[PDB]
């Protein structure tokens, strides 16, 4: 008998799993909302803003209307190399944003020490990818890396058709603090990462006015062999591709059709992405430079450090947010959480969802979300930034691990406005002028100097319809 090889491995369920971490793909938890779980791990935060700041120049007429296509091509070329490093060193890419990716090595407490060594070596090899790299003069094709370790909480929230997850807690807070202290080419360890690490492996230096540390060198002991050490570490890595599947980047590439599993996983993925997965939309339709309105919603909690309290509050806010967005075909693109604010990146005018009066509707939707979430138990402060303009939209990442992402100055501006003007709804000049709403519905704001924004233009508070 003949023995033809190569199984089919391009099923819809596999294409869906590319959009999700192993944390979700192999998660098998209750469909109850909110769901919370607790574990330990090492977190890696890779700041990729250095090369995603490329977006505004790809709007230049020099790119002859192929700006979005060239942008996603060069972005994915560089991001795929980072992704391959994380995956081969045994990490799980949790999420992509325009400015960062976050990765997790989930492990039992006893193994934190050795796993930190694996993650430091991975971090240094990521920097190694960009050591002699540039385009057109500027060599800002480099990264900054923050590492944390310790207790991690997971939250899954959503309704009967959509799901979202977050990792939260002190190690999550720590990894963002570590990454913010980093300069180009740095690897920063959180204080707890440094307290838990194998100090014989590494040479550090102090960070001024900080308990966090910078890695100068990984200088192993004399008889150390990283390959044999890594093999020992794989004992604790549940989904590391092995044996017959050692040639694959992800075990998720071996997923077989399972309708109950697929029903669960598709809830995390936008319908237009599912349409492409199902071969009912051209594979390149979602890569575009597109005018959108960003509505960036930040929620700050009474007790920041209480996972048990914030879970129901995010769920209650989500239930209201999703009902208000449905009304104008607004979408939640991402949910993020670090400085204990939970942030919803909402988008109006995505592909096939663009409708007249985007601007008025985005403002009314922001006000509605603001009023409801302010009355939600345990939510201390709601802040909403609204910015409109040309943003890049596209699937960002590696073939085996990628996400639909929005990138652009107006994304960064809405994110900065909600942090710099807390407790209010703010909008940019485009939204204000284009709403055509009466001038007295707004308040002209003092100009603030905001991180990573230069010519922000006049900013406004959306006061609303009444003096009250
Ligand atoms: N927690 C989380 N659980 O899963 N993913 C989380 C997360 O936070 C994350 C993941 C990947 C990238 C990322 O980018 C940094 C960022 N955080 C932002 C907050 C507000 C505005 C803009 C922001 N950019 C964040």
Author numbering: 1 to 468
The authors write:
Soluble AC (solAC) is found in the cytosol, is structurally and biochemically distinct from the tmAC enzyme family, and is synergistically regulated by calcium and bicarbonate ions.
The next round of synthesis focused on molecules capable of forming a hydrogen bond with the side chain of Arg 176; this was an attractive design idea because the side chain was easily accessible and sits at the mouth of the ATP pocket. A number of heterocycles were then synthesized that could retain this hydrogen bond whilst improving the π-stacking with Phe 336. This culminated in the discovery of the novel lead compound 8 (IC50=0.36 μm). The designed molecule induces a movement of the side chain of Asp 99 to form an additional long hydrogen bond with the benzimidazole of compound 8. The molecule also forms a hydrogen bond with the flexible side chain of Arg 176, although the geometry is not ideal. The inhibitors were discovered by fragment-based drug discovery and occupy both the newly identified allosteric bicarbonate site of the protein as well as the ATP pocket.
